[PDB]
Design a binder for this molecule. Structure first.
Ligand code: NDP
Ligand code: NDP
Lengths: 477, 477, 477, 477
């Protein structure tokens, strides 16, 4: 059970300012807790404190930044079940998927702990011509300054971690705005950070609705905005950011290709397709939305995938036997069911699932979806997948690329040539081979091209964005 | 002598579309040549051709990109004197400084030739926890796509090279808009590239005035805008760029510190201060504008710097004995002379030089300039320097940092502690030790923080910005 | 108190084979414990088991190797005081220096834990010319195979750790022979490793006297010999090693230079000189043996160093107020006192200390030692230091280099030029600036040139030596 | 035609000391030239001069080392046909293969030119724990010192280049002993180097027979021996080398696997198998000796390979239509024909070729060769290949590994799983996919494990071996 109320964190300190943000249990619909909602005055105060903490943060030695991160790792391990249960409530996340997220939260912070003590530089040969005889270069990474972080509803812990943990490793103060539907995970991160010896102003965690969050984008005291969320929002915020650096982690309509040589592997393939399409009710930025299957294996794959989809239990996410929990809201279920209805009216067929009861949307598989349909081209963000057929690998690649988006794609194949062609031709951040696009391991470079992002996360890459190189050129004569 | 007319380059081809852009000899004021001016229809056509060339460019093997760059190097060596003389005319650049720029143009292209065949990736351990057993990552750099390049008047060849050469190494088509006051250097680069086997649309070089250049910032078919020019313009273009990545190389009011231990080195220090403050008439983004001298050596430095400044010959830049050529225009000379007059009226003193005859602005040294004056705080971009005194090194560092800007700074010292403190505390892209901030070698990371830039040039760093990483995750079971 | 007896570790298992190796308390001289001594049959069996464990070790995933190392870290933290007290007894090491070594043991294993999950490779551009169009390279590091490790008496824990920890990170089975005078630390490492899930044959820890240890050098089933010990032994073993790779970590007569600018820093300098010369009774491979002091500060340094040397308490290493413990044996004290006597007979002067009572050799400072004396040129390995004067920095560098050896040197200076010159000219593995040569941090590359070594330790560098690169060249057509 | 006589190069200077080494045309058998043979007095003088050149070489700036290498590249391009014709004569190398070697000589020197200006170091975080607060590390690569180089007969130019070019890039003086059967290529390299501004003693090129070459291994003034040649010699020299570092590039009995999925690719596979087995008469350290073909494609591959082998013209290597030139001597042809006869007597069958006329050994293919035969297990080094069959991929890998050797192997496959398994399991330096093991590109890491080598060549890797790291540790307080 969640605590009755939660504070926000203003310049490292818990402030029980109000109880104005109600957070519901996404399965029962009951109010599960109330948290303090930050207004513009509080946001402004947090930003000023972050400016004031910039020098103290920059002066922390590497091993001290590591020690802060290690304290977080230890506390997250100690509170593992509490954290997983909180995710289950506030995100409606099936308990096995919630435990999966807490395991990843720990991985992300542990990678950051390791990277905090290996932010190395280079000794550069500058003697490339006679004019530069006797010069040598030395590099270091300096913290960029105060960072503005905005995170989405669907991984309340780990996607905040992908900003918070590298900021601490890099030596940047930050102000984090979690999603209002799922703020508790970030507030527990804040609680744990408040136990450490960080300078005042090193961090704030401030719940705020989007309509009250302008300063997170526009305030000129932030030197970086790093936003994870919908493409419609992220590209709009880039336009308003001003001088600061912008990093965007957005969405897409990810595809998985199943090649002709997969007959003897179909039970594995189907298990992974069902995971990617339907885990956490399809609410993943790399959830499987489109499945392109080679004609040689299409019928066998279809039959097994219909049976697998029908087998997935929907219900209370606290029950470990539940695979499909509630979607995040009835309004989001209605968005997706409208797209599904429109695809069917235009000729598509529901071949497994299809029933929708409020936010309880069954795992659903469709055939014959037109490539012009919203269900095909927009980001479904729910427990639906589209199955389509191809006859030659080039056509599968073209159809994956027939999208505004480009986050990840997956290919199940034993062909070396097809693996190489996919790497060459798929206009995505990441191509996964012999697993779904929905796979991520927390050290890997991660992000999108096209409308799906601008930049990469994963600890090393976030540290790079959160620092500025400073060159020392030394002339000897 | 320049050719009578020059074409522009539209999708690799010379087009003598008109003679509407007059280019003056900046010393005599006479029209030296006329070049074709691109309109919006031509700019749009160039962008479409760049889209069409994206796939052919991406498919060029590394050694073929290298061969294009090597052809450029060979031709620039063959045409060395022609190129230097063209710079002398169109930029009013003293012939020794013009030869210096051509030497650097060759360095920049040679570094790019070397880097074109070493765009390596990583094999990443992904087995950081049990969930990721059997996964491995492989990385590559993919060209970002069509690039929009805008360059300034003062290094007509080398600052274009810092965009063009890495684009070719990385496999990106590009459209370059040179400065209208100095377009010839870029058009000679275009002429040389037109001799190579590049696919149609690989490059365009299009003169256009700023008021006709909106598409270089706003067109959504470009995936990167890389702008080198004034801070007032660059920050405004970032706001209008839309989704594309933005790189900015801007300006500043660079300082050099002369430490207490420099008495026996003062003739060297003074020679370098005069170079940094007055070469190419102070028209460098890292020209020395402010000189902070320790009280122990202030008087001796002052005396030598007055004598050195008075010794610098001003006149015809074609004469190898000329040190100070014309400024780029009478209007720019009038801007700077107005700031100088205002500083004097407020209490400053001209201690060497000070005479202004049209665009012929003498090398000038001032004392007693208030830190609130435009001459102190804005970008002088002319042959003036301000001398000021300090008593302890911390105060010198604070005064360097007392600026909107942060491009480079220099420190003449033999103190290891002061060298370390400068690297820690100077909020600049680069700190130069025992030379002026005006030093750059073309492989080094180069750029500004604060209002002076966003990102780095130097070949390796430009290639990074002109590419997207693409991860291949391979699962073995 | 040590346990009454210790086993050896044969293919991961404790074997109480005999009690034939007596280990004395180096202060009291009493037998403190008895340990099992391995004969040739046991050594041969260990090597065969290491061969048999090669494939299982190579197949362990990275995170499992990390988990083994993490178990060691946790157990060493839990047993910190026990480990420090054991060092105090078996090595006669002052308790503060013993705690220092255990702290370093933990650092070494923690660095190895981090490095175990970042043994990355490269994706290499191979398209350097037309013949190689369509080829790409991919690299990995494969364990070299069974490793033979030999460690010395003076850091019974940490110098074994610098071989054991990287071997585990790299996936190599190993057989370790500790020093017979100080085997207990290695046997506690073995005890802790025996608690982990490693495959049988992953490790053996076998006490054996040098005269029974031929197989550690000659057996052809080992693919690497890594030896830490005296130069006279190491160079002789290289000759007998056969086909295997050889890494040598040897000794020297390390020097510290004190520059002319150090007057206001002399109390710091003297504190560090006394640490480097006299900690663990001078029994460090990078102990300060020679002190070169600039004429400007010589007298002031001399006076302070005489007073500091006289202040160092000699006695029972279990007492935290003891600075100078016993030397490792009376025979080693007699070796050094003979060299000291010979230097005095030839004209040197003892200016502080000089009294020798069995293995209790006082911290001692000499002046006027001829550069031809054994005390100058050979490895003292005891609590003596020689002070000499210089007038110009070039002469100090020449005198540091006037040696068979080249491990580390130190320079106390604030001159940037002198720092640069020292890095250029000192023929050593490592140059330390503003600390003694006796400083090491366990991640840094570490080793000697000239007669002082061949190769580097420090975790990353040891992993490199304990692996073979394996290139995959893939041709696409 | 070769020149009538050639000098040797002693400390950069041509010395026509004698004409005692006759070099034959390996096709006609006539003496083609006579070269000066170095005695022990000359070898000793060269070594002393290399010691004397160590400091001047170390002080050369990077761009000057690059300029020396660039001069070599330009001269080799200018003299391309001369160099190829000399190889044709002294090595009996078919002119197309000789031109191939000269092309590679240029690649090797060009890679070295590029690498000479990018010998970078690292700025290392040393703040891993509180003891190391305020310390930072900086690295550089220092030349190791004088190098001893020994090269073999079969690539008279390029295998010398793989030692000479990195030595120059790294700043090491060297003494090169080419093969007495083929010294001319190395003497032309020496002639070209003698045109450059290198300090006296930077290089010597000294022909000497093995029985007069002891000092190349034993002299203690060399700090590295790098040997390319037979395994029987290389392992013996390691035993005699003393203190110096040893690098070995040796031989093997390389295998190519043809997988079940290759039917539609067999003409390509057969073309590459014939190249690898029979180019330069099989005289390659990575020549194809063993061909393992999957049962599904065995008969079709066999038929095509018999026809291809029979089609290869044997004769005068000056004729561009000749594929198979003479072997290096009649004695080497007799060695191999004896092994072939013994394999046939034990049950093997010659299925194509088999005729031997002096040094003219036809391209030959055998079936049914016992795995215990010398022809199978020893290094053939001539134009013979053995064909054998397998039914499952694991067995093919085991049979490749059933050898004393481990240089390179090749696998023709479209299976991703088999590619991965080959990389995991083949105990070789390099695994080539979709080409023969006989492929090398001159920048790639290259060398053997097991009895085939110790260390890697390829420019970057040779530079690493020819340098020592020197760490600078700087403490700030
Ligand atoms: N690339 C990646 O790593 C991932 C990206 N995503 C993407 O996130 C989306 C789903 O998450 P969801 O939370 O619904 O996304 P939203 O874009 O609706 O919201 C994301 C965050 O942005 C905030 N926000 C919205 N508008 C503004 C604004 N004008 N100013 C400031 N903050 C604002 C929200 O605040 P509030 O809601 O409190 O009003 C929330 O904190 C999908 O598109 C998905 O692909 C998800 C996970 C992975
Ligand atoms: N890994 C690699 O890069 C390559 C290795 N090789 C290997 O080289 C061999 C073929 O070449 P080959 O020339 O016949 O090899 P050898 O081993 O017969 O001779 C190689 C070189 O070593 C010299 N040499 C031989 N014995 C001594 C000695 N005691 N002291 C000093 N020098 C000595 C030879 O001198 P001289 O002949 O003048 O008496 C020659 O210069 C094969 O085993 C092949 O695999 C070949 C090419 C590639």
């Amino acid at each position: 059970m969640l605590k009755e109320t939660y504070p926000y964190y203003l310049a490292n300190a818990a402030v029980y300012a109000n109880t104005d943000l109600e957070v519901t249990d996404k399965y029962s619909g009951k109010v599960a807790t109330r948290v303090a909602l930050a207004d513009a005055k509080a946001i402004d105060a947090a930003i000023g404190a972050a400016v004031d903490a910039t020098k103290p943060m920059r002066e922390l030695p590497a091993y001290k930044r590591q020690a802060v991160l290690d304290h977080c790792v230890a506390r997250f391990r100690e509170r593992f079940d509490e954290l997983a249960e909180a995710l289950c409530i506030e995100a409606g996340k099936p308990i096995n998927d919630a435990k999966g997220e807490v395991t990843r939260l720990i991985d992300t912070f542990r990678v950051a702990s390791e990277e905090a003590v290996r932010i190395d530089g280079e000794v550069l040969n500058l003697e490339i011509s006679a004019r530069a005889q006797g010069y040598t270069g030395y590099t270091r990474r300096v913290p960029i300054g105060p960072c503005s972080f905005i995170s989405p509803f669907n991984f309340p812990l780990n996607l905040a971690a992908h900003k918070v943990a590298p900021a601490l490793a890099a030596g940047c103060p930050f102000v984090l705005k979690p999603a209002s539907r799922t703020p508790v995970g970030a507030l527990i991160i804040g609680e744990v950070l408040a136990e450490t010896d960080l300078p005042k102003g090193a961090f704030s965690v401030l719940p705020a609705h989007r309509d009250g969050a302008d300063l997170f984008t526009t305030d000129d005291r932030f030197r970086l905005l790093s936003f994870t969320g919908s493409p419609a929002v992220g590209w709009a915020l880039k336009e308003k950011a001003g001088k600061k650096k912008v990093v965007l982690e957005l969405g897409g309509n990810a595809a998985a290709i199943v090649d002709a040589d997969q007959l003897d592997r179909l039970d594995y393939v189907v298990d992974r397709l069902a995971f990617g399409a339907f885990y956490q009710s399809g609410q993943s930025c790399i959830g499987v939305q489109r499945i392109l299957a080679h004609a040689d294996i299409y019928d066998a794959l279809r039959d097994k995938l219909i049976a697998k989809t029908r087998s997935l239990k929907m219900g209370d996410p606290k029950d470990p036997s539940t695979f499909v929990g509630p979607m995040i809201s009835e309004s989001e279920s209605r968005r997706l069911s409208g797209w599904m209805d429109a695809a069917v009216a235009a000729g598509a067929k529901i071949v497994a699932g299809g029933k929708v009861d409020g936010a309880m949307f069954e795992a659903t598989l469709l055939e014959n979806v037109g490539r012009d349909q919203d269900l095909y081209r927009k980001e479904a963000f729910g427990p639906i997948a589209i199955l389509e057929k191809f006859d030659r690998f080039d056509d599968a690649l073209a159809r994956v690329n027939d999208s505004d988006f480009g986050l990840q794609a997956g290919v199940f194949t034993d062909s070396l040539a097809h693996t190489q062609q996919a790497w060459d031709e798929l206009e995505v951040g990441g191509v996964v081979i012999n697993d779904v696009p929905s796979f991520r391991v927390d050290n890997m470079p991660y992000g999108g091209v096209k409308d799906s992002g601008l930049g990469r996360e994963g600890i090393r890459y976030a540290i790079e964005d959160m620092t500025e190189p400073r060159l020392l050129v030394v002339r000897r004569r």
